[PDB]
Design an enzyme around this catalytic site. Structure first.
Site, PDB file in Angstrom:
ATOM      1  N   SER A  19      33.561  39.917  25.239  1.00 20.84           N
ATOM      2  CA  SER A  19      34.207  39.103  26.402  1.00 20.84           C
ATOM      3  C   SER A  19      35.231  38.096  25.499  1.00 20.84           C
ATOM      4  O   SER A  19      36.123  37.721  26.116  1.00 20.84           O
ATOM      5  CB  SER A  19      33.152  38.065  26.894  1.00 20.84           C
ATOM      6  OG  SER A  19      31.645  38.791  27.329  1.00 20.84           O
ATOM      7  N   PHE A  20      34.945  37.927  24.442  1.00 20.18           N
ATOM      8  CA  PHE A  20      35.824  37.164  23.486  1.00 20.18           C
ATOM      9  C   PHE A  20      36.152  37.644  22.059  1.00 20.18           C
ATOM     10  O   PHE A  20      36.743  37.008  21.329  1.00 20.18           O
ATOM     11  CB  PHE A  20      35.482  35.642  23.445  1.00 20.18           C
ATOM     12  CG  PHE A  20      34.089  35.400  22.763  1.00 20.18           C
ATOM     13  CD1 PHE A  20      32.909  35.453  23.557  1.00 20.18           C
ATOM     14  CD2 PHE A  20      34.207  34.922  21.559  1.00 20.18           C
ATOM     15  CE1 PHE A  20      31.841  35.147  22.887  1.00 20.18           C
ATOM     16  CE2 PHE A  20      32.930  35.038  20.770  1.00 20.18           C
ATOM     17  CZ  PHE A  20      31.727  34.896  21.583  1.00 20.18           C
ATOM     18  N   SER A  21      35.789  38.906  21.909  1.00 19.81           N
ATOM     19  CA  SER A  21      36.092  39.544  20.642  1.00 19.81           C
ATOM     20  C   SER A  21      36.621  40.846  20.829  1.00 19.81           C
ATOM     21  O   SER A  21      35.891  41.439  21.680  1.00 19.81           O
ATOM     22  CB  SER A  21      34.937  39.201  19.572  1.00 19.81           C
ATOM     23  OG  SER A  21      33.962  40.079  20.119  1.00 19.81           O
ATOM     24  N   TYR A  88      32.180  49.265   8.366  1.00 23.58           N
ATOM     25  CA  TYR A  88      32.316  50.106   9.604  1.00 23.58           C
ATOM     26  C   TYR A  88      31.092  50.929   9.492  1.00 23.58           C
ATOM     27  O   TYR A  88      30.620  51.464   8.663  1.00 23.58           O
ATOM     28  CB  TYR A  88      33.536  51.004   9.150  1.00 23.58           C
ATOM     29  CG  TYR A  88      33.754  52.018  10.169  1.00 23.58           C
ATOM     30  CD1 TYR A  88      33.592  52.030  11.572  1.00 23.58           C
ATOM     31  CD2 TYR A  88      34.301  53.473   9.679  1.00 23.58           C
ATOM     32  CE1 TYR A  88      33.752  52.859  12.550  1.00 23.58           C
ATOM     33  CE2 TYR A  88      34.454  54.303  10.602  1.00 23.58           C
ATOM     34  CZ  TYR A  88      34.329  54.269  12.011  1.00 23.58           C
ATOM     35  OH  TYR A  88      34.699  55.440  12.663  1.00 23.58           O
ATOM     36  N   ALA A  89      30.398  51.161  10.704  1.00 26.56           N
ATOM     37  CA  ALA A  89      29.165  51.806  11.146  1.00 26.56           C
ATOM     38  C   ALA A  89      29.570  53.020  11.892  1.00 26.56           C
ATOM     39  O   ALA A  89      29.468  52.801  13.134  1.00 26.56           O
ATOM     40  CB  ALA A  89      28.056  51.091  11.668  1.00 26.56           C
ATOM     41  N   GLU A  93      26.241  52.665  18.222  1.00 27.02           N
ATOM     42  CA  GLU A  93      24.954  51.762  18.359  1.00 27.02           C
ATOM     43  C   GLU A  93      23.774  52.715  18.567  1.00 27.02           C
ATOM     44  O   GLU A  93      23.912  54.034  19.259  1.00 27.02           O
ATOM     45  CB  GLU A  93      25.421  51.384  19.986  1.00 27.02           C
ATOM     46  CG  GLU A  93      26.171  50.260  20.084  1.00 27.02           C
ATOM     47  CD  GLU A  93      26.463  49.611  21.559  1.00 27.02           C
ATOM     48  OE1 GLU A  93      25.911  50.146  22.313  1.00 27.02           O
ATOM     49  OE2 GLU A  93      27.529  49.113  21.589  1.00 27.02           O
ATOM     50  N   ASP A 132      19.187  37.755  19.471  1.00 36.51           N
ATOM     51  CA  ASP A 132      19.716  38.761  20.255  1.00 36.51           C
ATOM     52  C   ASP A 132      19.410  39.970  19.765  1.00 36.51           C
ATOM     53  O   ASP A 132      20.447  40.870  19.829  1.00 36.51           O
ATOM     54  CB  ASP A 132      21.152  38.407  20.516  1.00 36.51           C
ATOM     55  CG  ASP A 132      21.510  39.084  21.683  1.00 36.51           C
ATOM     56  OD1 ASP A 132      20.736  39.454  22.545  1.00 36.51           O
ATOM     57  OD2 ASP A 132      22.742  39.027  22.255  1.00 36.51           O
ATOM     58  N   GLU A 136      21.764  47.848  21.376  1.00 33.02           N
ATOM     59  CA  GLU A 136      23.269  47.427  21.174  1.00 33.02           C
ATOM     60  C   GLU A 136      23.757  46.813  19.930  1.00 33.02           C
ATOM     61  O   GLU A 136      24.948  47.124  19.642  1.00 33.02           O
ATOM     62  CB  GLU A 136      23.744  46.739  22.471  1.00 33.02           C
ATOM     63  CG  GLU A 136      24.966  46.244  22.414  1.00 33.02           C
ATOM     64  CD  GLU A 136      25.476  45.652  23.714  1.00 33.02           C
ATOM     65  OE1 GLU A 136      25.892  44.282  23.765  1.00 33.02           O
ATOM     66  OE2 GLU A 136      25.340  46.220  24.868  1.00 33.02           O
ATOM     67  N   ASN A 137      22.956  46.210  19.524  1.00 30.37           N
ATOM     68  CA  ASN A 137      23.196  45.465  18.187  1.00 30.37           C
ATOM     69  C   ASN A 137      22.834  45.928  16.881  1.00 30.37           C
ATOM     70  O   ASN A 137      22.955  45.671  15.849  1.00 30.37           O
ATOM     71  CB  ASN A 137      22.868  43.920  18.243  1.00 30.37           C
ATOM     72  CG  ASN A 137      23.553  43.271  19.270  1.00 30.37           C
ATOM     73  OD1 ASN A 137      24.632  43.533  19.417  1.00 30.37           O
ATOM     74  ND2 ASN A 137      23.141  41.838  19.728  1.00 30.37           N
ATOM     75  N   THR A 172      19.310  38.135  25.487  1.00 30.65           N
ATOM     76  CA  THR A 172      19.761  39.279  26.519  1.00 30.65           C
ATOM     77  C   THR A 172      18.314  39.367  27.262  1.00 30.65           C
ATOM     78  O   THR A 172      17.527  39.302  26.604  1.00 30.65           O
ATOM     79  CB  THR A 172      20.184  40.506  25.996  1.00 30.65           C
ATOM     80  OG1 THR A 172      21.599  40.290  25.041  1.00 30.65           O
ATOM     81  CG2 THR A 172      20.138  41.432  26.719  1.00 30.65           C
TER      82      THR A 172
HETATM   83  O1  LIG Z   1      30.850  47.769  18.011  1.00 32.50           O
HETATM   84  C1  LIG Z   1      30.998  48.065  16.995  1.00 32.50           C
HETATM   85  C2  LIG Z   1      30.934  49.670  16.546  1.00 32.50           C
HETATM   86  C3  LIG Z   1      31.143  50.679  17.629  1.00 32.50           C
HETATM   87  C4  LIG Z   1      31.193  51.862  17.731  1.00 32.50           C
HETATM   88  C5  LIG Z   1      31.268  52.186  16.191  1.00 32.50           C
HETATM   89  C6  LIG Z   1      31.226  51.559  15.144  1.00 32.50           C
HETATM   90  C7  LIG Z   1      31.112  50.148  15.342  1.00 32.50           C
HETATM   91  C8  LIG Z   1      31.334  49.236  14.474  1.00 32.50           C
HETATM   92  N1  LIG Z   1      31.095  49.379  12.999  1.00 32.50           N
HETATM   93  N2  LIG Z   1      31.013  47.840  12.518  1.00 32.50           N
HETATM   94  C9  LIG Z   1      31.010  47.044  13.547  1.00 32.50           C
HETATM   95  C10 LIG Z   1      30.854  45.323  13.458  1.00 32.50           C
HETATM   96  C11 LIG Z   1      30.931  45.021  14.820  1.00 32.50           C
HETATM   97  C12 LIG Z   1      30.681  45.920  15.942  1.00 32.50           C
HETATM   98  C13 LIG Z   1      30.935  47.242  16.001  1.00 32.50           C
HETATM   99  C14 LIG Z   1      31.013  47.674  14.720  1.00 32.50           C
END
Ligand SMILES: O=C1c2ccccc2-c2n[nH]c3cccc1c23
Length: 286
Positions: A19-21, A88-89, A93, A132, A136-137, A172
């Site tokens: 909503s804000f990021s 970066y993941a 999710e 939370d 999703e987190n 949530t």
């Molecule tokens: O929403 C995602 C996200 C969604 C898909 C793939 C990678 C990411 C991702 N990689 N690092 C962060 C830190 C915060 C949020 C998100 C990430």
């Protein structure tokens, strides 16, 4: 190091929107490193009363140094925006995988549950409540280990006052604890309730309290109104029954139940080698 600036990066696709990021994939030109950069518009956060959440996220993330949490590498701003440089993941999710596969086998449920437990042990050991916790987190890196995110609604409990309870109403619906609904406060054990909902969801395919609107979910949570499907792994069912307990002082893992030792010792985790999970090769989901 030299404070970073937007022109130090090549921005790519949007990874996530809130909503804000907005979180955008970026490559740092000088290093070729990829970061997930969370970007907030100052005017929007200022107008919409969101500054405290942004400051909270920065403060909490700055305290964490553990493989199972997204790391905050750097921050910078320009006239219009705030930027947070995050891990970066690449695999996104955990929820995506639950939806695609339907549910997880026992080995996979155990491994991912153990990573989340290990993460919570660390977090709680620092006196921080997430508040939370949900699929999703819980992000997945390139190597398929977890990286927990979203700390704007987290709370650092004050060591000076031996604080145990926090009063902000956040969370949530599917994962919110009964104490937050009824007593209007949360504690570390509130994250253990969320854990129990998550374990249930990994095995059953859906979280245990579910409905088409929030009030109906709340009504179910406060009454402990849920059931297990058939073939739900018995030791996982036992574990979930020990987490989804209305009395927050009676959940396995909580301080009044003598902490993480008894939780890690639960029979569901018999095979688990707890000390180096992030260096183990995760089991394949399929
Ligand atoms: O929403 C995602 C996200 C969604 C898909 C793939 C990678 C990411 C991702 N990689 N690092 C962060 C830190 C915060 C949020 C998100 C990430």
């Amino acid at each position: 190091p030299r404070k970073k600036r937007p022109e130090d990066f090549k921005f790519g696709k949007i990874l996530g929107e809130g909503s804000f990021s907005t979180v955008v994939l970026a490559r740092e030109l000088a290093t070729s490193r990829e970061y997930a950069i969370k970007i907030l518009e100052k005017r929007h956060i200022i107008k919409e009363n969101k500054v405290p959440y942004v400051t909270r996220e920065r403060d909490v993330m700055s305290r964490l140094d553990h493989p199972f949490f997204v790391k905050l590498y750097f921050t910078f701003q320009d006239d219009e925006k705030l930027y947070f440089g995050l891990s970066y993941a690449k695999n996104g999710e955990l929820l995506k995988y639950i939806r695609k596969i339907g549910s997880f086998d026992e080995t996979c449920t155990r491994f991912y549950t153990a990573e989340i437990v290990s993460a919570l042990e660390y977090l709680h050991g620092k006196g921080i409540i997430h508040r939370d916790l949900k699929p999703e987190n819980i992000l997945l890196n390139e190597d398929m280990h977890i990286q927990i995110t979203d700390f704007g609604t987290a709370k650092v409990l004050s060591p000076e006052s031996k604080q145990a309870r926090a009063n902000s109403f956040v969370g949530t619906a599917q994962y919110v604890s009964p104490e937050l609904l009824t007593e209007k406060s949360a504690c570390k054990s509130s994250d253990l309730w969320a854990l129990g909902c998550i374990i249930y969801q990994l095995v059953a395919g859906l979280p245990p309290f579910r409905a088409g609107n929030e009030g109906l979910i709340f009504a179910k949570i406060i009454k402990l109104e849920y059931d297990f499907p058939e073939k739900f792994f018995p030791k996982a069912r036992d574990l979930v029954e020990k987490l989804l307990v209305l009395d927050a002082t009676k959940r396995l893992g909580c301080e009044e139940m003598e902490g993480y030792g008894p939780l890690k010792a639960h029979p569901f985790f018999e095979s688990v080698t707890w000390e180096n999970l992030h260096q183990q090769t995760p089991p394949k989901l399929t």
